Design a protein around this ligand. Structure first.
Ligand SMILES: CCCC(=O)OC[C@H](COP(=O)(O)O[C@@H]1[C@H](O)[C@H](O)[C@@H](OP(=O)(O)O)[C@H](OP(=O)(O)O)[C@H]1O)OC(=O)CCC
Length: 131
């Protein structure tokens, strides 16, 4: 339907620029795109949503409230989508890391504000891994 492509010409180039990691050497490729699509179809979501910045936003917003009841399988998607979505809004984050902060910071402002005390505190962070 009217060229079922995720990223256009100018977008494709920039896409290849961004990398999976900030201090890595592995850049983004079509694999990372088509991949998320093959998975979306499993999450009751069409891969066509990636053919529109407006849609890429709904994806992150949908899985957002599901990031709690989901494993890495959903964590990886959010990452990729974050980079792609940015591309459409004319963004080329230095890495998949700057992409998550650019979308998280917007929400952090409200968090650190609403809390500004119960969202950090001093010493009170525990952790216990399994075997
Ligand atoms: C042909 C097979 C299908 C295909 O094209 O699949 C494309 C990929 C899976 O294959 P891959 O690209 O080799 O896998 C990635 C690399 O090893 C990368 O170095 C690693 O980063 P780090 O985090 O360890 O530094 C990633 O780790 P997490 O994302 O699990 O953390 C890992 O997924 O699907 C995805 O999930 C990409 C999501 C961005």
């Amino acid at each position: 339907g009217a060229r079922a492509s995720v990223l256009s010409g100018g977008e494709l180039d920039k896409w290849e620029k961004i990398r999976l990691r900030p201090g890595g050497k592995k850049q983004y490729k079509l694999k990372h795109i088509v991949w998320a699509s093959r998975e979306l179809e499993r999450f009751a979501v069409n891969p066509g949503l990636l053919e529109t910045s407006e849609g890429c936003r709904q994806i992150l917003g949908q899985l957002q409230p599901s990031l709690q009841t989901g494993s890495e399988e959903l964590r990886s998607l959010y990452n990729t989508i974050a980079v792609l979505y940015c591309v459409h809004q004319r963004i080329d984050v230095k890495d998949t890391k700057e992409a998550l902060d650019k979308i998280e910071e917007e929400q952090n402002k409200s968090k650190k504000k609403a809390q500004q005390a119960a969202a950090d505190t001093g010493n009170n962070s525990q952790v216990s891994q399994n075997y």
